[PDB]
Structure 1
Amino acid sequence: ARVKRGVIARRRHKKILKLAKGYYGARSRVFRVAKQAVIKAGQYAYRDRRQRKRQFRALWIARINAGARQNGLSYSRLIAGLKKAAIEIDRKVLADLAVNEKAAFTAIVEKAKASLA
Structure 2
Amino acid sequence: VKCTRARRLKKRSLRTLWINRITAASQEHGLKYPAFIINLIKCQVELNRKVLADLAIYEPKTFKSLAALAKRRREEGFAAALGDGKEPDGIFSRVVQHR
The reply to whether TM is greater than 0.5 is yes
How far apart are residue 60 of structure 1 and its match? 0.1
2:7 maps to 49
How far apart are residue 101 of structure 1 and its match? 0.9
Mapping of 1:73-112 within 5 angstroms? 73-112=31-70
1:65 maps to 23
How far apart are residue 46 of structure 1 and its match? 1.2
Q: TM-score, normalised by structure 1?
A: 0.61
The answer to which structure, 1 or 2, has the higher relative contact order (CA under 8 A, 6+ apart) is 2
Percent sequence identity over aligned pairs: 41
How far apart are residue 47 of structure 1 and its match? 1.0
Which runs of 5 or more residues in structure 1 are unaligned? 1-42
Which runs of 5 or more residues in structure 2 are unaligned? 78-99
CA RMSD after TM alignment? 1.0
Q: Render the CA deviation track for 1:18-42: whole Å, top value 9, x for unaligned.
A: xxxxxxxxxxxxxxxxxxxxxxxxx
Q: Which runs of structure 1 show a deviation greater than 4 angstroms over 4 or more consecutive aligned residues?
A: none
How far apart are residue 70 of structure 1 and its match? 1.3
Equivalent pairs, count: 75
Amino acid at match of 1:92: K
